[PDB]
């Protein structure tokens, strides 16, 4: 709608002015070179001192027409390994769910820090991926090895 594009422009200015080290975010370009304000590309650095360290994990952010009434959908690549990431890549996070802790005022910075925090601290109440949750709960060594190889996979 029109609140939607005004808000996304303000978000773009705000992010570009101040954001955590190692993140990036930019509207994808449309066929005419203009920005698709409702679909962004971003990168989430792993926290140093975790098995996630060294990776920069790419995500896509798709803003619905009713944003900010409705939250954006955030997806990792299909097949990303994590207990809170659906097979589709959809992240299970309270702030990204309109039925939970989403509030219109939540900003991109808060979303990306939420995702970073989720990385090394999975939430058991959102098991979106059977193998990741199972390994986490039954074979922690395998989970850590997989995380380390995925960090190499997405190396900074």
């Amino acid at each position: 709608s029109s609140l939607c594009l005004q808000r996304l422009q303000e978000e773009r200015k705000k992010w570009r002015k101040d954001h955590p080290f190692g993140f990036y975010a930019k509207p994808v370009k449309k066929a005419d070179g203009s920005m698709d304000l409702q679909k962004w590309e971003a990168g989430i650095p792993g926290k140093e001192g975790t098995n996630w360290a060294g990776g920069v994990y790419p995500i896509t952010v798709e803003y619905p027409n009713e944003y900010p009434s409705k939250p954006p959908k955030v997806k990792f690549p299909a097949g990303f390994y994590h207990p809170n990431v659906y097979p589709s890549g959809t992240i299970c996070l309270s702030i990204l769910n309109e039925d939970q802790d989403w509030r219109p005022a939540i900003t991109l910075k808060q979303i990306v820090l939420g995702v970073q925090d989720l990385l090394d601290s999975p939430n058991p109440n959102s098991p979106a991926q059977e193998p990741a949750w199972r390994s986490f709960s039954r074979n922690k060594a395998e989970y850590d090895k997989k995380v380390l190889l995925q960090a190499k996979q997405y190396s900074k």
């Binding site: 080290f21 990036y24 203009s34 193998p131 390994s135 039954r138 395998e142 190889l149 190499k152 190396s155």
Partner: protein, 1012 residues
Amino acid sequence: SIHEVVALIEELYSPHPKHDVNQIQQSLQSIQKSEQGFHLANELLSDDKYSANVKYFGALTLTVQLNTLWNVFRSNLLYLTKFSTLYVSNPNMYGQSLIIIKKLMSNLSLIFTKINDPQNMIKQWNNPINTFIQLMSVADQLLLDSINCSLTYEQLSQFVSLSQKHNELALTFTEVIVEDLTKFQTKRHSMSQIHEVVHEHLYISTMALINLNLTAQAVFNPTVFDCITAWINYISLTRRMDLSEIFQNLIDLMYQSTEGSDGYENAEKILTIFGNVFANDPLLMSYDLRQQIECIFLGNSWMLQYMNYLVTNDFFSELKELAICIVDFLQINTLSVCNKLFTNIVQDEYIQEYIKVLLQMTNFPLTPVLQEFFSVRMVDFWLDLSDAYTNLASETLRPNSIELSTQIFQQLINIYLPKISLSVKQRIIEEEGESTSVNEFEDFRNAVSDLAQSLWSILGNDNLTNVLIDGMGQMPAASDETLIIKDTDVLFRIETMCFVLNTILVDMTLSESPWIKNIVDANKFFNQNVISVFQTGFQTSASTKVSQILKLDFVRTSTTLIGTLAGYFKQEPFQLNPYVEALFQGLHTCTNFTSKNEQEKISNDKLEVMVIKTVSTLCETCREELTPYLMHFISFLNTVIMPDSNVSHFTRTKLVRSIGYVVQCQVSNGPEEQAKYILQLTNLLSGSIEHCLASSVQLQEQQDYINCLLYCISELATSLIQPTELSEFQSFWSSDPLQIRSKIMCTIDKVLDNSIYCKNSAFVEIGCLIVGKGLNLPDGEPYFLKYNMSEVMNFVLRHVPNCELATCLPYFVYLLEKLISEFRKELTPQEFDFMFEKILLVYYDAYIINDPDLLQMTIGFVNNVLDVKPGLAIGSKHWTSFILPQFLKLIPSREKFTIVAVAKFWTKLINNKKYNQEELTTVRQQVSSIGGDLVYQIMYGLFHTQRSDLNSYTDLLRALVAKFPIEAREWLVAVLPQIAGHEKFINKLLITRGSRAAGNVILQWWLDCTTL
């Protein structure tokens, strides 16, 4: 007890108090507010012999007024009384007594907020500033009544400013009131009219006082600056309030504030105010004042003198704030400059000098981050200008638009290229070390990379890409052999050119473009200089941490650009040879070396990862061109797989993946020549696995080595899959005379026959992945590892009893689901009964029924059978005897995934369209028998459940009502009263709906049936 109160008040603030600090604090919270707390507070404020902290506690005790309408008036009278008391004791000469002054101001601000809210009587205050004004004139208690609501004019208000502390107290009172109105508005929005009261009385007094401080020299006090920002913040939250003259006089003061006159203190504070306006609500300033700001910043000129004052004194923080303010000011002006530049809708030479000065300011001496942030904030501006020019209409361009844009943006390229030079990061790590300035430099480089990606749509390939290529391709970076540059200037220049060229070339397609072949062939030293950067950085000895990190940065940039060039390598194969040789020389240097001292190995692993990543991209695109190098590589792998190597298991896996990428395209000479390589790799992996399991009794090292080789087998199985981008291979791999599947299956059996491995979930996972690699592949694809039904079945039957049933069963079950979807045509309900009996039913009552993971696993398996071939599940011997009673009892389950599993089971069972006509008749007959108990389980779960599971048996009821509307009422009139009479209401309202809007009827039924 007043002596006791003063005793423990002074005890709380003593350096090392007695009894406890928390206890005396709780007792102090207990004395207040109770009916003597108010009189205690008045006695604490009226007594001059008490300490300042005790009087502050008196004003704090007064603050507890939330405890109805009369005590507020009795409090506010004594608030204004002790107010006028200390505020008369201040202006003569007291000093450091304004702490209680600010606390009493805060208490009166809270009173002003609480009284003017919606809810003999007491009218509104309307203007506390005036009331405070006349309170400095001393029949006595009668004065506050007439002084409160109506007061004097502006001439007496200026007469109050006879002293400096008078003006300071007035500025602070208005400031605290505004900041508190801001905090109260931000907390909860019930105001809506108090803002109008401030707009009608307080706004006028505050504007007249601020303008008096700005215009008059003697009345000026710097505290007003901190008050102006407060007012601006409150205005930014609401909306008409002018503020135009305030901004005008602040501009005049900043221009008058010089080094000799003010020492640039007022200019700094006013610039902080303007930076706040431009950064938060820039529209708050009118167009005329923004034009004056433009004429002051860009002009010898006053702005150049202030910048030189900040530079000569080494003030990097204040220069940072200046850059933030100027950039936030320039970002709101874009369409006017873009129009007067590039659209035709005396001004030309003016805007040419305008852009010339803006480019001179864009350059700005003093290296970045370490010193300046001008380029860092200017990147976002140039991004907005590039997008604005790209968003311009085609028919609106100027005749000289493309030439002027090309000229301006090329001067931008020539300016920003030395800015992001790696010599800056070198000096940052030299002076500041590993600080956050390095991180800000990395964010600056990413911002300039996106700037170039947006600038390419204007400059094109010849004005942006060919400038870099001709810059690094027509001159040798290293004349001496081994490609040692020996020169620092050209090395920094070429690292900058390689980074920009990489970020520009990623956005391209080097296969469809013949232009890349034309531009590289016109440059003799291009590939030589790229390899010169890789070899110079890789062979660089890491002495300090700076040389180590720079070594890693050079290797990262080189391997990334090499990874981006695979399409051109497919278009120009003869330039590919120097890259492969230079890469494998460095690849062996970082492989066969075991020198670790000590955290150097994490840099070795980062280099090894980026190298093997580039190898994976090249093998992914240039499979055909890389055929001659295969025979050397398999031998080097045979030397790497030794139980002594520097590679990670991940690098071993990606190496096996790279060889498999090159082997996949060896379908030319027939399946025999490609199978020679495939059989050699199969015998090497299985031979080293069997060598490790039966020689060095498996420890954790042997377990990691076996897991590594199994992942190598998985990467080899994935790499041999034909990319989505004849019959001889089908008959060969259908027969596989070399026994690739026989050797792989016997190797997996040897690993899973060991007790230390079969009960581990990781080995079962990778085993079921490798065996199920050939499943669900498009038929006709000559896959080598395509297994039949009996081989995978006997495999699972082989390793399922001896494994751990809790953690290892879902991988075998997912493999069976893959086999079921693959062999759906040849499956038989008796074979399905055989799999259901052997793998699940025997282990059900002990390990599955009480395990949620295995329970949802079994339900998902039955759902897979219903999705693929329902005739197998319907024609089961355990269909009516086992599947239906068990899943009937599991309906009001406590696990979310189990609830969703059972609901999907019955939903697919009802809405399945793959049923045969006989299967559909038998299903409708059986459902028309158990439907009763179904509604009972639905209402049983819906009753005992709570929110977030209500929509689960809604879709089940939607399908059951749509499919069975007639028996729905018969089953509802029996199931509703058991789980009073009002329940009948849902019957008429639900069946009438049919579907798609139930739940709305259902929660309106649950609300009734819950209270009872």
